[PDB]
């Protein structure tokens with residue numbers, strides 16, 4: 398085909414990016430994260446007990462209001478690092494952008510307060526491969542490719558910096574291609590290590606000039622559902638030590654007044670140096686020496702098979718517009734704008 402649909406994304410404080418999909422007939426709208434690190438679609442169910450506070454404060458899907466709804470009922474449990482949800486499988490029509498696909502998804506009936514009482518979105522749309530799909534449910538992008546409507550079998554992410562301004566696009570995904578209005582120059586392409594996970598090799602990670610970490614190679618998951626860049630505890634410990642950063646309960650901080658003069662951090666990908674300055678990775682609420690400012694980087698120990706691995710989240714994708722290419726099993730980076 399020749400189609401490329403775009404989906405507008407909301408940017409909440411430069412930490413949560415999500416868009417909107419419609420489920421059912423007539424369509425019930427949900428705010429969802431589009432997550433390349435996972436492969437299942439799910440939203441909270443009307444059958445989720447209000448005993449779960451997350452299901453009081455988020456949109457629920459009511460199967461009995463959709464004429465296109467088709468019952469399945471098989472149990473589903475999804476364990477992410479940050480917490481588990483459970484429920485059962487349902488089939489219905491899902492619209493994303495201008496596209497409309499019949500999709501199997503989770504109706505979630507168990508939804509823990511941590512982390513979901515902190516979620517500004519209702520559910521997630523996993524943009525990963527069927528290899529990572531729990532229950533081997535066919536991922537939504539696979540079902541879209543099957544339609545043969547897409548100009549190209551790729552999708553791309555633009556995440557924007559948060560702006561007080563009313564308009565200001567928080568972010569954008571394109572199904573079928575990439576929007577040259579939000580990247581300059583050409584895509585540098587890097588092959589996946591293997592099909593089945595949006596992960597590439599990384600030759601090193603530099604702090605300042607000294608190529609300090611990952612000196613002899615490591616993995617990089619390009620993860621749109623991740624808010625910060627993550628590395629292994631032991632990598633991150635070193636990195637934070639280099640920066641003089643202090644470990645708090647939920648984050649790493651520096652004195653705000655010194656954030657600006659902290660060193661660059663470069664990720665060596667596909668033969669090229671991808672650099673983030675301290676302006677890229679410090680949340681500079683102020684520049685006072687009496688306040689502490691959060692870094693958009695933290696530790697996450699991801700278990701095998703996928704880990705140990707770094708994850709390149711929104712901190713990274715903000716600077717580099719990212720194209721996920723399913724036809725060629727590669728990822729492209731171009732400077733964002």
Ligand SMILES: CNC[C@H](CC1CCCCC1)NC(=O)N1CCC[C@@H]([C@@](O)(CCCCOC)c2cccc(Cl)c2)C1
Nearest residue numbers: 412413414430434477479512513515516622623624711
């Ligand atoms: C596998 N991929 C990475 C994984 C995805 C995540 C999707 C929702 C359900 C759980 C798994 N994110 C992840 O591990 N993060 C670190 C913990 C906080 C997340 C996150 O910041 C993500 C916000 C949306 C995306 O922003 C870019 C957050 C905050 C509050 C509540 C929840 Cl629910 C999740 C980002």
Ligand SMILES: *[C@@H]1O[C@H](CO)[C@@H](O[C@@H]2O[C@H](CO)[C@@H](O)[C@H](O)[C@H]2NC(C)=O)[C@H](O)[C@H]1NC(C)=O
Nearest residue numbers: 467468469470471472486487488501532533534
């Ligand atoms: C829910 O989905 C499951 C998984 O796709 C369906 O189970 C499969 O159904 C097909 C068609 O009858 C069988 O060929 C497979 O062997 C089934 N998988 C197995 C081994 O369980 C199930 O039928 C769906 N539920 C309903 C009632 O539609």
Ligand SMILES: [Cl-]
Nearest residue numbers: 610611612632
């Ligand atoms: Cl290391």
